[PDB]
Design a protein around this nucleic acid. Structure first.
Lengths: 823, 94
DNA sequence: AAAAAAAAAAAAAAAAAAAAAAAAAAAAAAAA
DNA sequence: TTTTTTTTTTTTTTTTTTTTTTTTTTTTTTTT
């Protein structure tokens, strides 16, 4: 043999014995360096590259999930890394650039990249994946290349980003992201636009996991990263908190516009999966607070506690994480005179969390007695509103944080109850009092009286006092006898939050009836926008307390939701839904009442109106909530609800889509009779849906806007899945003898002879085999299905990919009917 | 009509919220081979032929950008309560 | 012009595949 | 000249959706 084979047995031995258990890589890279040194000192460099490519191409058919190839691709990665670190140490202090290890390295990578990129077009997935991996792992240590080779690499990788399999696209986005050292300026030689195109456009939920982390994350690309907090995959949603925000760390408070910084933690702490919530909790709980050196006040100054109302969740993620700062924070005497917004929010959070867990130690010490907090509250109320640094927005926030601190305070001191009742009575009597402080003040005046009757008479006293204050200035300022518009607004806003918290019938609470006959009934009949809106809302909060009032004003609610503007239809629809939801069905179908068919027509006119999105959304949520409470037993309205789920004109209301996504499954799953109702509607639902899809598919418009409707195969699958008697939530046992899914299938095979399209029949017939088949069913519900499948298989001409599934159902039905009549 | 059923729905349909599509269900080799052979390379170095190795045009771009939509939550707490009174739970499943 | 031809698309359906988080463990460099 | 971290690497869990199976029909390829 010759040196062409000595090099071959050397590389064969080292790449064979290095395939297992990573043993002796410091000897492997050593002896590979010796043989490359002796080869270039000899001079068979192209032969060395050729046997290199030979022993590499003996690996390339091995797939992903194979360790034996991985321990060689990381060996050659360690080899090119060894040459790269030798050149890095050669440019420095001692000038070790001798024997031309720059030229050997450049020609080596110029030949090996030209070899692997010849294999990038092969039809096997494994060779393309291993070529782009064998580039992508070493592309960081490759360094400088030729512009023709750079163009070939970027053309190959920019074609391989749209490769058919995802596993090669992973190595494609890796080898793309190693080419990132440029100035960023954009509106195909740039890698960053390609990675953004993959981070949005790619169908694999795994290519985004390697195009999301490995990007550059400067000022420009950052929303393209951060909107991956709403990724399709759960692992990406968790990993944006795990490895991107945790990586930036301290710079997140100064490098993110606060509209997104108050959106990311709301997307985290209100997610649907537990691991991403725990990742956001551990990000707000461990990394950041130990990154700005433990200062809770400095973190709260950067979590913008004044505007964003998300922090009441996030600070709880601190208190459930490490209790040393829960027990370390003490509130001395010399800080209640000089509050800031952050420490008032801190006192609020720590006190309501301490009463949530009933820690009696911090309830005992370290917190002031109720009269002292009453002194602080009256101090801030008088410093804000009894006026003639201290900005109005900050003072309003400090009073609202200490009022939430006050709404669950210790009743045991009568002096504290008396003091805080005087402070809240002297605060809520203010004319220029803002609205959230009105709400929380009425909340404290409820939660510190002895009962509901004392809160009712106190709030009626305050509201009638603010009315008498205006009637005196109307009487005196001439030098007719009704209140103004602004004081009617200020009285109704207090009455709203008052009647939000009353929970009793109104026979023995006659001050609410006097308030209604004085104010609310002359607020509904008014002609202003906001007065009518709050009048309908207050009328609804009164109608959730008495049934004769609801049966009185349901007519004017129906007329004002059938012939009014947007916000009145919103509030009136909410009131109609809530009146039904509380009072049952003594509101319709009787004497003196409203006829419920008229209300169903009003519900129809709201539900078919695409121009009112949120009114349609609350109509959908409302009708589903009333179906769950079984006060609505009508059939055509459920048919129109499921059509409105599946219509294409209601495909832009995302909230209506989620409303029907949650509250239709919880209908049929919670009770068997609800599933029977779904099975009775689903036949004509599928008929009208197939008609609508035919007329949408054969429509001739330059911009048709199709594909809002699902293809009816997935519609038939989800109709089966709602009408499947396995998934009932009850512990029945008898549910294995229910014939509802087979009745739906029999109705679908009845309506199967009522469509014209030739694809509709294919995607109806190819999916009938998902039904419940266990031979515990009735004789006739198998007999009618056998007859209809017989008639459809024989009499009508069907193709073979449909006759497969149809005669497969024939075989399963014949086997089960043989089991039925063998006994 | 109580906490067990509501929590069961809130734990099974908690991955069934995106809507129309994406509804969800159920609620050796060891080779050592490094020895020579002459013409193996053409079995792994060939052009595309009739095997189309790239993506369809109809899915190289997507218009929703693979974003999750805005999460109107619709958990069982938002279903069990009224709209104008968020502190009252109704007669559920009655 | 024209008689055959086989990978891809579509889709139902099934099960196991598998990246990731987290705990042991063998080769390796500073050390007194 | 054995010790003390380093470190990375290397086997258990989970539920994810992700790949793979199979039947048939389409749609660009080969020859005279």
């Amino acid at each position: 043999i010759d040196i062409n084979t000595k090099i071959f047995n050397s590389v064969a031995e080292v790449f064979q014995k290095a395939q297992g258990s990573y043993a002796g890589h410091r000897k492997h890279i050593a002896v590979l360096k010796k043989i490359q040194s002796k080869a270039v000192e000899q001079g068979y460099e192209d032969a060395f590259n050729f046997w290199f490519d030979k022993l590499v191409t003996k690996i390339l058919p091995l797939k992903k999930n194979e360790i034996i190839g991985d321990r060689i691709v990381k060996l050659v990665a360690a080899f090119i890394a060894s040459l790269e670190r030798e050149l890095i140490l050669a440019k420095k202090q001692n000038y070790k650039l001798t024997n031309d290890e720059e030229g050997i390295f450049s020609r080596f990578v110029d030949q090996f990249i030209r070899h692997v990129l010849r294999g990038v077009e092969s039809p096997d997935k494994n060779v393309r994946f291993r070529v782009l991996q064998l580039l992508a792992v070493i592309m960081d240590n490759i360094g400088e290349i030729d512009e023709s080779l750079f163009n070939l690499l970027i053309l190959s990788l920019n074609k391989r980003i749209y490769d058919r399999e995802p596993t090669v696209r992973i190595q494609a986005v890796f080898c793309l992201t190693k080419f990132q050292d440029e100035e960023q300026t954009e509106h195909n030689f740039e890698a960053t636009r390609t990675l953004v195109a993959s981070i949005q456009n790619d169908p694999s939920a795994e290519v985004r996991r390697a195009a999301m982390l490995n990007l550059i994350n400067d000022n420009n690309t950052r929303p393209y990263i951060l909107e991956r907090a709403r990724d399709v995959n759960i692992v990406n949603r968790r990993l944006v908190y795990s490895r991107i925000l945790k990586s930036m760390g301290r710079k997140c408070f100064d490098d993110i516009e606060p509209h997104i910084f108050d959106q990311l933690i709301e997307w985290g702490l209100e997610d649907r999966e537990l691991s991403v919530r725990n990742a956001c909790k551990r990000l707000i709980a461990h990394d950041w607070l130990n990154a700005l050196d433990g200062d809770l006040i400095e973190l709260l100054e950067k979590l913008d506690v004044s505007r964003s109302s998300v922090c009441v969740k996030a600070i709880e993620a601190l208190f459930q994480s490490r209790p040393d700062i829960l027990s370390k924070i003490k509130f001395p005497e010399s800080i209640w005179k000089d509050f800031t917004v952050e420490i008032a929010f801190l006192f609020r959070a720590i006190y309501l969390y301490c009463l949530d867990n009933n820690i009696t130690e911090m309830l005992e010490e370290n917190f002031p007695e109720a009269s002292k907090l009453s002194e602080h509250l009256n101090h801030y109320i008088l410093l804000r509103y009894h006026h003639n640094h201290f900005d109005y927005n900050t003072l309003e926030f400090i009073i609202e944080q200490l009022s939430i601190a006050a709404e669950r305070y210790d009743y045991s001191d009568e002096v504290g109850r008396r003091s805080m009742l005087t402070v809240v009575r002297n605060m809520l009597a203010l004319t220029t009092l803002s609205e959230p402080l009105i709400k929380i003040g009425i909340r404290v005046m409820k939660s510190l009286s002895i009962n509901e009757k004392d809160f009712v008479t106190m709030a009626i006293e305050i509201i009638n006092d603010i009315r008498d204050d205006d009637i005196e200035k109307q009487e005196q300022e001439e030098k007719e006898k009704e209140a103004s518009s602004a004081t009617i607004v200020l009285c109704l806003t207090r009455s709203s939050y008052m009647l939000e918290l009353v929970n009793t019938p109104l026979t023995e609470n006659i001050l609410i009836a006097s308030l209604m006959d004085t104010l609310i009934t002359p607020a509904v009949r008014n002609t202003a926008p906001n007065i009518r809106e709050l009048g309908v809302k207050n009328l609804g909060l009164c109608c959730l307390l008495d049934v004769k009032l609801a049966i009185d004003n349901m007519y004017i609610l129906g007329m004002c939701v059938s012939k009014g503007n947007a916000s009145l239809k919103y509030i009136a629809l909410q009131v109609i839904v809530d009146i039904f939801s509380v009072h049952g069905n003594t509101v319709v179908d009787g004497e003196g009442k409203v006829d419920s068919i008229s209300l169903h027509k009003i519900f129809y006119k709201v539900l078919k109106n695409n121009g009112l999105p949120e009114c349609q959304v609350i109509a959908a949520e409302g009708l589903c909530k009333l179906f769950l409470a079984d006060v609505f037993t009508d059939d055509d309205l459920f048919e129109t609800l499921v059509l409105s789920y599946f219509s294409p004109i209601n495909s832009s209301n995302e909230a209506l889509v989620q409303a029907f996504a949650f509250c239709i499954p919880v209908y049929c799953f919670s009770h068997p009779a609800h599933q029977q109702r779904m099975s009775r509607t689903a036949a004509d639902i599928l008929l009208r849906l197939c008609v609508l899809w035919d007329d949408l598919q054969s429509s001739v418009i330059p911009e048709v806007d199709r594909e809002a409707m699902l293809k009816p195969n997935i519609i038939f699958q989800q109709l089966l899945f709602w009408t499947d008697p396995r998934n009932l939530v009850n512990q029945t046992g008898s549910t294995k003898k229910d014939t509802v899914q087979l009745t739906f299938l029999i109705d679908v095979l009845k309506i199967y002879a009522q469509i014209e399209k030739k694809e509709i029949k294919k995607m109806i017939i190819t999916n009938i085999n998902a039904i419940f088949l266990s031979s515990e069913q009735d004789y006739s519900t198998l007999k009618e299905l056998l007859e209809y499948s017989d008639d459809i298989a024989e009499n009508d001409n069907l193709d073979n990919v449909s006759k497969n599934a149809l005669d497969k159902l024939r075989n399963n039905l014949n086997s089960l009917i043989e089991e039925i009549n063998e006994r | 009509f109580e906490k067990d059923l509501m929590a069961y729905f809130d734990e099974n349909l908690n991955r069934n919220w995106r809507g129309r599509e994406h509804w969800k269900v159920r609620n050796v080799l060891e080779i050592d081979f490094f020895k020579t052979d002459d013409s193996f390379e053409d079995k792994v170095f060939a052009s595309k032929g009739r095997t189309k190795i790239d993506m369809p045009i109809k899915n190289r771009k997507n218009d929703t950008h693979y974003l999750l939509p805005d999460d109107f939550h619709f958990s069982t707490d938002r279903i069990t309560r009224l709209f104008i009174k968020p502190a009252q739970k109704m007669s559920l499943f009655s």
